[PDB]
């Protein structure tokens, strides 16, 4: 699923600016 | 067409309200932006009680002003770092544009002042925590939350654009939840006055508009694409395009395809996709219309837009708050030392702040 996908490999957590 | 003539008079007169309150506000803003303010306290008038969090720079930590007992956060900005990192003008304009805003879902600026070390910023505390600690404990928003929060970002943003402001950082991690349950924009550190189109590459990946990442200049509707991906993130429980690292992000992005869950209403997802839409001609705040494409979506039909700014709207989550100084809606982090040297350090290119 979509939301699995993002637990798998998406960021999670808090996310930084460049 | 879609309004009597009650309906369509009375959007008009508010349409028209809204344009007399924005000239106000940009009068008063463009009077503290030409003249600042600056050094309305000191360090040792405060009590450090606990790391917050980390801005876009430096960390914020909770304190407690002696005379008063009154708590803040106060953002510390390490001068030889920032320096360090080419973000001396960042950190000037930031507060620049803190003293100058004034908007019940903008953080207040309440002292500023500088030392041999470092640069302080004041502000107020707000202790129901950031949304993205609420959004990832509970999932995803259901949509009339996820509203909520988005129609104060719609007039802040409002707000914002019409002081020539782009604030090009939007996320769940920098909005707080404050202790009535409406919502506080909290870091300016990319932000910009800007007459018309830019260039830099800035803000956070899930959330850049694509002309931002490819090499064409962009103007403020890289906001809009911005509250897209909010209320994406918002309603869904995740970011519409991901990936492990910003590079591969940045390909999605730009691939551009967008899908959504079963769940999201029909009215949401023409709101997106009409937000979410690489082609500038055709996004939603950035057409003749202006915001007011945005304000009269049907799936904003129930907001109550004046009610919002009035704050006398229900909140959906009221956050739990024991006592002055209470910490138990954040995070815990690193405790390090405020050191200060006992030479100054880069004093001349801090002389504004």
Same mark, same amino acid.
């Given at each position: 699923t979509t939301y699995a996908d993002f637990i798998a490999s998406g960021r999670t957590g808090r996310r930084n600016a460049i | 067409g879609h309004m009597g003539n009650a309906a369509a008079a009375k959007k008009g007169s508010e349409q028209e309200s809204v344009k007399e309150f924005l000239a106000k506000a940009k009068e008063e803003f463009l009077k503290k932006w030409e003249s600042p303010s600056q050094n309305t306290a000191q360090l040792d008038h405060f009590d450090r009680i606990k790391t917050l969090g980390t801005g876009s720079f430096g960390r914020v930590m909770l304190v407690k002003h002696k005379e008063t007992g009154n708590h803040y956060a106060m953002k510390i900005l390490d001068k030889q770092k920032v320096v360090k990192l080419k973000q001396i003008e960042h950190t000037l304009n930031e507060k620049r544009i803190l003293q100058a805003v004034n908007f019940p879902f903008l953080?207040?600026?309440?002292?500023?002042?500088?030392? $041999?070390? $470092?640069?302080?910023?004041?502000?107020?505390?707000?202790? +129901? +925590?950031?949304?993205?600690?609420?959004?990832?404990?509970?999932?995803?928003?259901?949509?009339?939350?996820?509203?909520?929060?988005?129609?104060?970002?719609?007039?802040?943003?409002?707000?914002?654009?019409?002081?020539?402001?782009?604030?090009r950082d939007l996320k769940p991690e920098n909005l707080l939840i404050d202790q009535q349950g409406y919502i506080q924009v909290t870091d300016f550190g990319f932000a910009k006055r800007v007459k018309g189109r830019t260039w830099?590459?800035?803000?956070?990946?899930?959330?850049?508009?694509?002309?931002?990442?490819?090499?064409? +200049?962009?103007?403020?509707?890289?906001?809009? #694409?911005?509250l897209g991906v909010l209320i994406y993130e918002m309603a869904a429980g995740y970011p519409p395009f991901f990936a492990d690292q910003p590079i591969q992000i940045y390909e999605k992005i730009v691939s551009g395809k967008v899908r959504f869950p079963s769940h999201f209403s029909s009215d949401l997802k023409d709101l997106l996709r009409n937000l979410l839409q690489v082609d500038l001609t055709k996004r939603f705040g950035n057409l003749? $219309?202006?915001? $007011?494409?945005?304000?009269?979506?049907? #799936?904003?039909?129930?907001?109550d837009w004046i009610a919002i700014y009035q704050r006398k709207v229900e909140a959906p989550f009221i956050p739990k708050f024991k006592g002055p100084g209470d910490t138990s809606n954040f995070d815990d982090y690193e405790e390090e030392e405020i050191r200060v040297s006992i030479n100054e350090k880069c004093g001349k290119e801090f002389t504004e702040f």
């Open positions: - | 953080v207040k600026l309440e002292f500023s002042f500088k030392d $041999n070390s $470092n640069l302080y910023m004041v502000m107020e505390y707000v202790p +129901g +925590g950031e949304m993205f600690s609420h959004l990832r404990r509970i999932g995803r928003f259901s949509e009339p939350h996820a509203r909520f929060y988005a129609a104060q970002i719609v007039l802040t943003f409002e707000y914002l654009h019409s002081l020539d402001l782009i604030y830099t590459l800035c803000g956070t990946p899930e959330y850049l508009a694509p002309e931002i990442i490819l090499s064409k +200049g962009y103007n403020k509707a890289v906001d809009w #694409w911005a003749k $219309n202006g915001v $007011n494409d945005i304000k009269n979506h049907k #799936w904003f039909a129930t907001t």
